[PDB]
Ligand binder design. Structure first.
Ligand SMILES: O=P(O)(O)OC[C@H](O)CO
Ligand SMILES: [Co+2]
Ligand SMILES: [Mg+2]
Length: 418
């Protein structure tokens, strides 16, 4: 009737040092709240975790909490498999102040009609440029001056390669960085209806001259050996920390593993922008994930979930997550606490991710994205970009095809949710 501990499965995609920090947070919560036991389980990369969560729901054994990457948001929002987080709190009779979250992040994860959070913010990032300062030195570059523009990056990459580095430049999450964020950061839409927020009748718009020229630049670098393709996700993070790759654009959340494993002096810079683009940079759009609560659980489970989510949002815990991982602080209090503890004084580049998100007030179409079936559109994008790196298709053809294929998935979602 109440003597049994309530076990609460939490399925996530936090690998390496990120996962160790998730475990530390769960363990502390469990110690302070012994009526509950949060049980984190690593289920693979974000695609694998989302697929596993959806499949488990079909058979009634979904976890209580599921970490879903940012692009899965519209899909989850239309899902009948979730209990919106604001409702989890409401029905459990626990107060939660949504205004605590930084507006960019709360907006991203909020319902259009009610303004309420449908999932809980936790790990948000923007892409940053990691660079090997030691490698810069022996290539004759100023180790305190990362390339500000793509043009500069290509130049540096050539010099780093000439100096003996195995790889000059590589990128994590190419869709997120080279197209989604490339668009926002250079003042362009990724999709219509303001990057999807204004309706399911959105179409993809990333096949414009600016994006095509950008992909062409990367392909020219690839041919020269100055750019290396190493995969669709976080593969470039290890290529950087093991010394292979001199520069990588990767999640700000890669910092946990990079700090632990890089045995050289490294720096963090902002994403390069297009030198020719007037009024660039604009602002970055977030990556990372949010925490979804699955439908069909008992009241004890939802009480425990609400308590755990509240725990994660406490200033000290939100601040600790940001400081340890490189994900940006997602509450106002966590940002202020980090600043007031002198963390940014000690670690100058540690607020880069926030600064990119807030570089300028957003244009109507640089607030984030919200597109149904985006997890599959990401795969389409990866396939088409891979056809560029192999020389099978031109940058124009690949982006045109990704738009055509991707739009088919957007119309499929539109029809499904009408
Ligand atoms: O590595 P993350 O957690 O910042 O996520 C990267 C991309 O946003 C995933 O879609
Ligand atoms: Co009992
Ligand atoms: Mg569909």
């Amino acid at each position: 009737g109440s003597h049994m501990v309530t076990t609460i499965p939490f399925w996530h995609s936090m690998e390496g040092e990120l996962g160790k920090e998730v475990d530390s947070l769960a363990q502390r919560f469990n110690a302070e709240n012994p009526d509950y036991k949060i049980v984190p389980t690593y289920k693979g990369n974000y695609e694998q975790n989302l697929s596993a969560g959806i499949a488990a729901f079909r058979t009634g054994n979904a976890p209580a909490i599921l970490q879903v990457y940012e692009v899965g948001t519209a899909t989850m929002m239309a899902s009948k498999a979730i209990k919106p987080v604001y409702d989890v709190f409401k029905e459990a009779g626990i107060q939660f102040d949504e205004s605590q979250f930084v507006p960019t992040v709360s907006g991203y994860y909020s319902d259009s009609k009610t303004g309420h959070l449908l999932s809980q913010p936790f790990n948000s990032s923007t892409p940053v440029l990691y660079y090997n300062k030691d490698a810069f030195k022996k290539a004759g570059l100023d180790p305190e001056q990362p390339p500000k523009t793509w043009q500069d990056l290509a130049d540096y990459a050539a010099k780093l390669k000439a100096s003996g580095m195995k790889c000059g430049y590589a990128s994590g999450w190419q869709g997120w960085i080279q197209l989604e964020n490339f668009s926002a950061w250079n003042g362009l839409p990724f999709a219509s209806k303001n990057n999807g927020f204004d309706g399911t009748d959105a179409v993809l718009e990333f096949n414009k001259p600016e994006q095509v020229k950008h992909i062409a630049m990367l392909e020219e670098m690839n041919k020269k050996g100055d750019f290396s393709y190493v995969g669709r996700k976080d593969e470039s993070t290890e290529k950087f920390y093991n010394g292979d790759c001199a520069m990588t654009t990767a999640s700000s959340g890669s910092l946990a593993n990079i700090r632990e494993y890089a045995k050289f002096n490294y720096g963090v810079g902002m994403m390069p922008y297009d030198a020719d683009a007037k009024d660039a940079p604009q602002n970055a759009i977030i990556g990372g994930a949010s925490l979804w609560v699955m439908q069909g659980k008992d009241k004890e489970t939802y009480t425990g979930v609400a308590k755990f989510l509240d725990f994660l949002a406490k200033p000290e815990n939100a601040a600790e997550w940001h400081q340890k991982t490189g994900y940006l602080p997602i509450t106002k209090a966590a940002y202020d606490l980090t600043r007031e503890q002198g963390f940014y004084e000690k670690n100058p580049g540690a607020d880069t991710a926030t600064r990119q998100m807030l570089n300028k007030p957003p244009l109507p179409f640089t607030k984030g994205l919200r597109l149904g079936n985006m997890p599959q559109i990401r795969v389409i994008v990866d396939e088409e970009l891979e056809s560029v790196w192999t020389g099978k298709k031109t940058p124009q053809q690949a982006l045109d095809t990704a738009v055509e294929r991707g739009n088919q998935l957007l119309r499929r979602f539109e029809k499904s949710t009408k």
